[PDB]
Amino acid sequence: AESHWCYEVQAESSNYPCLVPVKWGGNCQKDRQSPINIVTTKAKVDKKLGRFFFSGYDKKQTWTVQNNGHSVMMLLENKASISGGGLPAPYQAKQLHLHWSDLPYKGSEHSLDGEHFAMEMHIVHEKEKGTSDPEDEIAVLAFLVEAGTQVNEGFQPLVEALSNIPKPEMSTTMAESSLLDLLPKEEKLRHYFRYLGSLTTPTCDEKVVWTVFREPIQLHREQILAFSQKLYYDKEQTVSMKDNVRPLQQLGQRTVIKS
Template structure:
């Protein structure tokens, strides 16, 4: 009987292990046929509160508690470490930058940023607005600082999502674009040749007052449903050549046979979840304001629990 139980446990654990170790995007699954495409991802990936979603802007509910963010350390320039992790390009942010305000119930510390893209300029974002995709999407991933003991926290991570469209050249992004040539293959790392700040990558601060908010998940396995999503309405502009550099210079595989592109998870069903939009009059909060503003997580979660 013990042997039978052990075998059953082993059999049940294999799909999870495969999803975590060998998951991939649709373009990889078609090329290699040796990894699990998004429809087969394990973990929490088949649950009901997943990301990304299509945001219908006219249906988003106004929430007056969703005011301006307070960005601390976002103006500090550094030569960031950049890596090809086999699924995206990731910038390691250390632990110096934080966000507060924006209807968040706590302060969150920035850990990393990464991007999703396509060689097709209207098919590279994970989230969409009114059914329209963008050329790319950048995620700045933050982790909650004041964690309270809870079996199933819905707000462990706060991800700031920025849509990217083709436009004029973005000098702030250029050090990251230039670093791509040094990390074509998975597990490769490099350091930017020029110091930049997080604010150098973002739209003007005044334009960050307008955003959408919903509760969802990570967009890669195990797709844990522990994310407060903020999707900003104002897109980042990059030149077409800057956008295409991501598809041209990076590869999914060590042999450099498959270019890294279309690294996006398909849209997920919104279901009964509520999507909110901000109302943030006036200028953004100064960087030195206290971290905590009016907690609204309970209000935001009311439609889910």
């Protein structure tokens, strides 16, 4: 650890040295890493991957949201959970965050058939374990975001909050909203891809069971641009927050499955 981990854009936009992704420490150099490209036609249908059950997702809350220096993060604090989805237990929701760029064809961490989307949103959950860490301790639900002309009203509380947290270490409270406000219609979340991998920022622990839903969130171009326009990586506000994206990792001998 010769310097703090960063994304490539930060290294390229500032003279202050930092460890770019290919140099990350932790478990970040192991072989069951994320994100990946998904060849959709090569992922086999597994019949055990049934629908999700979301709890606390429809409930209107006033969430705390913060700039942690690499993303914007909603604190979910077990106020929501999931089950089904071929998952082996209920998982409690801890936090939601995003990765993005400022061009529509990049911004997502995962790619589907070699296409990146404009953002990727991650909802991070923790396994409810029995008595005797595992490869599926954490369940991250990934939603791809497609750029368009449709104003997503569901996202407005979040997007408005961004102006209040431009620098790292800053928190604000969002206007009343639910998690379902931010997602596609529930009936469109029956199609998803599933594989085992890692966390995409250090320490990149190989303990994530990934879900990438097929159906994108639609967000207006300028609601997407609001992220890079209002947020910074640093207190000095020299680097606008964008391209907070880990490059693609090799699948190796892992298999990807779908519903």
